[PDB]
Amino acid sequence: SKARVYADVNVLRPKEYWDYEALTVQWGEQDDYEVVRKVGRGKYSEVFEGINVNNNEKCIIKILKPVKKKKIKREIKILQNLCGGPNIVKLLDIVRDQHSKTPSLIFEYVNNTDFKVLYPTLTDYDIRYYIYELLKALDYCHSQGIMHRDVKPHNVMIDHELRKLRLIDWGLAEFYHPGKEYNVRVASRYFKGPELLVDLQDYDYSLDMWSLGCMFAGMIFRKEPFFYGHDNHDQLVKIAKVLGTDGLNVYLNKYRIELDPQLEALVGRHSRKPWLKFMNADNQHLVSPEAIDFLDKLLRYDHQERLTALEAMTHPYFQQVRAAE
Ligand SMILES: O=C1c2c(O)cccc2C(=O)c2c([N+](=O)[O-])ccc(O)c21
């Protein structure tokens, strides 16, 4: 399997562009940035609102937790390659603690409101507007030969007051190379695409389109997360319970995938549950036929069937957003 778009981006660009292992970090000055307050955390890092001492400009300080040198060069290279793209967080500097050599990635300041409190207040139009903004970021990174591999609400910072969006945490991102077999242990469980759940290693940019689909479904249906599986095995079951097993079987045979006996047993046999079956008094104001058609074209078992970020942006669902632009 290969991407249906941007497949040769890294094939045509010089080795230095994607050969991140050959990167030699130009460490800046650790004293230039001061922590002001913590604002977040993850299994791989701690994030603080900071201040650039030279210009007293606010910034974001991401202190990385101990991890392999390769992974750190990877995140840095991708950040340097995407800097300046639409809605892509901007890496401003890279410093390290002299004594322990703990790395810190310095970014432009980003204002944010946790999705569990922001999302409930979004209007039908806000949702169209912000998803469109996210799609710009995804079409861009894909056009540059990179898969984010961890699209989820937590990684989409939004400054609702200024209606500004940024795609963050490129710590799991990778460069796409035709035919390469990647690690399937990426993204977050509720947003893992079927390819990751059934061990299809030669996946591509389309992976992010499933994750986006899950996020979108949660937003219009007010059911977060939309696919709530306890572990990887269960994650596929919850998915099968909605899209139906027939579609799953067509998919597995096309890619010659062997489902683990145990897992196959858990999935079972299920009919498809129409999207409208998910509409209720709490989400009726956000569910529209255009929203359903868009979502339907994203959540497909077969990754080659999903809409590309570029295709997604032209769907009539975003008509007024484009018109506004
Ligand atoms: O990784 C990031 C991150 C980044 O890579 C670039 C800019 C901002 C953030 C960020 O803000 C953030 C937060 N958080 O919301 O506090 C929580 C967990 C994270 O892993 C991050």
Q: Which atom of ligand 1 is nearest to the CA of 154?
A: 15
Rounded CA gap, 147 and 170, in Å?
Answer: 9
Q: Give yes or no for a contact between 238 and 232, defined as CB atoms under 8 angstroms apart.
A: no
Cα separations in angstroms, 219 against 42, 169, 265, 298, 322: 23, 21, 31, 14, 20
Residues 101, 223 within the same domain: no
DSSP 118-169: HGGG--HHHHHHHHHHHHHHHHHHHHTTEE----SGGGEEEETTTTEEEE--
Token digits for 82? Answer: 């995407």
Rounded CA gap, 166 and 134, in Å?
Answer: 7
Substitution candidate for ligand 1 out of 168, 170, 172 with most atoms within 8 A of CB: 168
The CA-to-CA distance between both ends of the chain, in Å, stands at 36
DSSP state of 91: E
**H or E segment to which residue 195 belongs:** helix 194-197
Rounded CA gap, 178 and 157, in Å?
Answer: 31
* Full residue range of the structural domain in which residue 324 is found: 1-18+110-325
Rounded CA gap, 162 and 309, in Å?
Answer: 24
**Ligand 1 in contact with 63 (CB < 6 A)?**
no
Rounded CA gap, 36 and 254, in Å?
Answer: 53
Token digits for 246? Answer: 């027939």
Bridge partners (DSSP) listed for residue 134: none
Q: After which residues is the chain broken (C to N over 2.5 A)?
A: none
Residues 276, 227 within the same domain: yes
Token digits for 36? Answer: 């002001």
Give SS3 for 171.
coil
Rounded CA gap, 71 and 165, in Å?
Answer: 26
Residues 189, 291 within the same domain: yes
Substitution candidate for ligand 1 out of 58, 60, 62 with most atoms within 8 A of CB: 62
Tell me the CATH number at 278: 1.10.510.10
Dihedral, CA of residue 114, residue 96, residue 86 and residue 223, to nearest 10:
-20
For this entry, resolution in Å reads 2.0
Contacts of 113 (CB under 8 A, 6+ apart): 158, 159, 160
Choose one of 87, 109, 131: the last residue of a domain: 109
How far out from the chain centre does Cα 122 lie? Answer: 20
Residues 86, 144 within the same domain: no
Number of domains in the chain: 2
Label residues 51-87 b or e (16+ Cβ within 10 Å = b): bbeeeeeebbbbbbeeeeeeebbbbbbbbebbeebbb
| Residue 114 annotated among the catalytic residues of the structure | no
Choose one of 42, 75, 109: the last residue of a domain: 109
Technique behind this structure? Answer: X-ray
Residues 171, 320 within the same domain: yes
Rounded CA gap, 155 and 150, in Å?
Answer: 8
Choose one of 56, 91, 109: the last residue of a domain: 109
- Cα 190 to ligand 1 centre (Å): 19
Token digits for 51? Answer: 């201040």
Rounded CA gap, 176 and 216, in Å?
Answer: 24
Q: Give yes or no for a contact between 79 and 65, defined as CB atoms under 8 angstroms apart.
A: no
Q: Give, using CA atoms, the residue closest to atom 13 of ligand 1.
A: 40
Cα separations in angstroms, 166 against 24, 118, 268: 27, 15, 39
Tell me the CATH number at 84: 3.30.200.20
